Design a protein around this ligand. Structure first.
Ligand SMILES: [Mg+2]
Lengths: 122, 121
């Protein structure tokens, strides 16, 4: 995956959590599309610096999508008071810029760590 | 950036806007209430406005009576930018007699959960 402040193992675990780490295309929930390996929505892509040619094309690339995640965490995680390890980054990914401070992402983190090889992932 | 104008059954008019220059995933929005007295120029008579945080992007506006006074409250629904797509919402009372005031807030709701039910429970 793309390098940056998020570790490779953490990115793998988030990828497995979101899609079983596959390019699953774009899926609709509530009239809103979420796309690809990391299930990135348009707002997320815009804020992660619009890497690649477009949101949907970036989301379908393991590299571009993970670069987007790296850029998103670089932009938001520290400043939200998140721990700079996977617990923080996973919860930001699931919950937005303050996800690591919201109860709504606790189950996501608890469950992500049940994926084989992801317990206590940093 | 999100902008929408709605006419209330009373004739008052409301606009809802995301904050200018802000990111997509987080920031603020404002609600502005106008008398709507002159229908040719419905934003000419400002009454009051409020600025609130938004945890995501504004997804939709609803006008529904939540308190049972047979007038609609405004509900602003916001969708988290994270993969979980969690919903939050603020409800506002708005009428000629009292003006514009917040009525309730919910957050961390699953994507397909009924926001209105949550605001009433
Ligand atoms: Mg009412």
């Amino acid at each position: 995956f793309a390098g940056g402040i998020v570790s490779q193992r953490c990115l793998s675990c988030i990828c497995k959590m979101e899609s079983g780490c596959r390019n699953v295309g774009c899926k609709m929930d509530m009239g809103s599309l979420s796309c690809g390996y990391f299930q990135i929505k348009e707002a997320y892509w815009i804020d992660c610096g619009r890497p690649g040619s477009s949101w949907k094309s970036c989301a379908a690339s393991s590299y571009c999508a993970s670069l987007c995640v790296q850029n998103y965490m670089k932009r938001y995680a520290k400043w939200a008071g998140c721990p700079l390890r996977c617990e923080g980054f996973a919860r930001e990914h699931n919950g937005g810029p303050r996800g690591c401070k919201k109860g709504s992402t606790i189950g996501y983190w608890n469950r992500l760590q049940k994926i084989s090889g992801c317990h206590g992932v940093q | 950036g999100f902008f929408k104008q709605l006419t209330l059954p009373s004739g008052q008019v409301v606009t809802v806007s995301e904050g200018r220059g802000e990111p997509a995933s987080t920031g603020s929005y404002d609600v502005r209430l106008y008398s709507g007295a002159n229908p040719q120029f419905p934003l000419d008579q400002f009454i009051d406005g409020k600025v609130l945080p938004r945890d995501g992007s504004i997804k939709e506006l609803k006008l529904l009576d939540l308190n049972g006074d047979k007038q609609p409250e405004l509900i602003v629904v916001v969708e988290s930018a994270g993969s979980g797509s969690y919903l939050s919402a603020d409800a506002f009372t708005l009428n000629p007699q009292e003006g514009l005031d917040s009525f309730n807030h919910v957050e961390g709701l699953a994507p397909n959960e009924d926001v209105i039910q949550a605001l009433k429970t």
